[PDB]
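Predicting holo structure, protoporphyrin IX containing FE bound.
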Amino acid sequence: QDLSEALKEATKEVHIRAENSEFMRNFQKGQVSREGFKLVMASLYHIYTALEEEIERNKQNPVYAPLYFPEELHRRAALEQDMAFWYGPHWQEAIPYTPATQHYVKRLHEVGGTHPELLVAHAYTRYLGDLSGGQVLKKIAQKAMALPSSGEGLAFFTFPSIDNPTKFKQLYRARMNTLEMTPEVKHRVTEEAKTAFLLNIELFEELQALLT
Ligand code: HEM
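Done. Tokens:
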């Protein structure tokens, strides 16, 4: 079985649970507010910064190299633009760094520095989601908060270097399937993907508590 299919099958259950977290449930209903949106986007800024720092550290490592697509996928630059939009010129000293966000970042650094063969699980969890349901979330946010079609405030959800997300997603999956795989690695990669989803659920649960 291809790694791309194994990951989808391994995370379809936790994905349903993630969609139904209180925060995401409210988001989908279009009940997302500026306060809550700023919290999630600031948290993602920290998460993608860590993820991409680890991707750079392992770009030449065969256990990840086939998935090195910084021009097309990396989100740090986009999040920096969004932070300036939502938090202003001095966003760097204004954005929050929640405990759940810190925990996620911690695991990313452990994986990138000690278990790089599992980094693909984290890239899969974040990037393939961004190219999929992330586009649905983008539309909901635009409608709920009156964000312009021009993209301001939603750079994170925009991929100017990718003509068609569906096509790129198929390419990314194909390259994922070229990674040298063994039962050992496949087993652990799918397990780490479930952990990545849980880290996201825990973040959402925390943000919801901060909002309520
Ligand atoms: C607000 C709740 C969410 C909505 C509306 C949503 C919706 C979707 C949709 C419509 C797809 C495409 C399904 C398909 O092609 O069969 C998808 C796939 C995906 N989502 Fe989400 N999603 C949500 C939250 C999340 C979260 C929290 C994560 C984890 C960061 C996530 C990660 C993924 C991944 C990795 C994929 C790609 C699956 C694959 O093709 O292998 N999603 N999502």
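The domain at 1-212 is CATH 1.20.910.10 (Heme Oxygenase; Chain A).
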